[PDB]
């Protein structure tokens, strides 16, 4: 719930997440993220879409 509460609200799967967190989140397909982020898909996917853009941005930073 601690992860879901922040997910449904302000969980950062961009830079706030770690290696496995961003990974497991990267697998948080629209179907799961949807519920855990019970919002509009376009809206929940966007939060996830930003999360990925950061994943590689932070990965290429090194």
From Swiss-Prot:
Subcellular location: Cytoplasm
Sites of Phosphothreonine modification: 5
Cystine bridges: none
Transmembrane segments: none
Subunit and partners: Heterodimer of DFFA and DFFB.
Known function: Inhibitor of the caspase-activated DNase (DFF40).
Protein name: DNA fragmentation factor subunit alpha
Modification(s) after translation: Caspase-3 cleaves DFF45 at 2 sites to generate an active factor.
Domain of life, source organism: Eukaryota
Source species: Homo sapiens (Human)
């Amino acid at each position: 719930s601690h992860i879901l509460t922040a997910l449904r609200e302000k969980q950062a799967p961009e830079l706030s997440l770690s290696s496995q967190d961003l990974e497991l989140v990267t697998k948080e397909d629209p179907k799961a993220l949807a519920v855990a982020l019970n919002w509009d898909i376009k809206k929940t996917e966007t939060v996830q879409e930003a999360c990925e853009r950061e994943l590689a941005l932070r990965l290429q930073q090194t």
